[PDB]
Amino acid sequence: RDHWIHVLVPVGFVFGYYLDRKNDEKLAAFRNKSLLYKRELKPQEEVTWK
């Protein structure tokens, strides 16, 4: 690519965004288990958030 240096900060955003989402699955012990937001799962649903 002739302008390969202009993707360092954008991909570093996306990858950083990726890691944040990848961290959320490590902090999902109370997913659908809070007293405020626990509910029965809708059909064709496995988790309430990702």
Partner 1 sequence: MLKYIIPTMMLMPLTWLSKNSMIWINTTLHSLLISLTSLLLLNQFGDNSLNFSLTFFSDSLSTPLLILTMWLLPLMLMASQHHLSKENLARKKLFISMLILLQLFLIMTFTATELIFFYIMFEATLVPTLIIITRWGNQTERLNAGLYFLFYTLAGSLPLLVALIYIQNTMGSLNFLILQYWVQPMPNSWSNTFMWLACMMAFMVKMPLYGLHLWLPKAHVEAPIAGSMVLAAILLKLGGYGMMRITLLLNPITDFMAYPFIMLSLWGMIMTSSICLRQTDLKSLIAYSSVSHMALVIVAILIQTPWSYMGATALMIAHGLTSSMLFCLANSNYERVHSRTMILARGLQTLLPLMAAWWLLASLTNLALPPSINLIGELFVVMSTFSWSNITIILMGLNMVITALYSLYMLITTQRGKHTHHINNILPSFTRENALMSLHMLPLLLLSLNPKIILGPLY
Partner 2 sequence: DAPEKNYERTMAILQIESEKAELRLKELEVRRLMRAKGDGPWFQYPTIDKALIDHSPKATPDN
Under the criterion CB under 8 A, does residue 33 sit at the interface with partner 2?
A: yes
Under the criterion CB under 8 A, does residue 5 sit at the interface with partner 1?
A: yes
Q: Are 48 and 30 a contacting pair, CB within 8 Å?
A: no
Q: Which of 17, 20, 31 is nearest to 39 (CA)?
A: 31
**Rounded-to-integer distance, Cα 43 and Cα 40, Å:** 10
Q: Which of 34, 44, 45, 46 is the binder for partner 2 (CB under 8 A)?
A: 34
x/- track of binding to partner 1 for residues 6-45 (CB under 8 A): x-xxxxxx-xxx-xx--x---x------------------
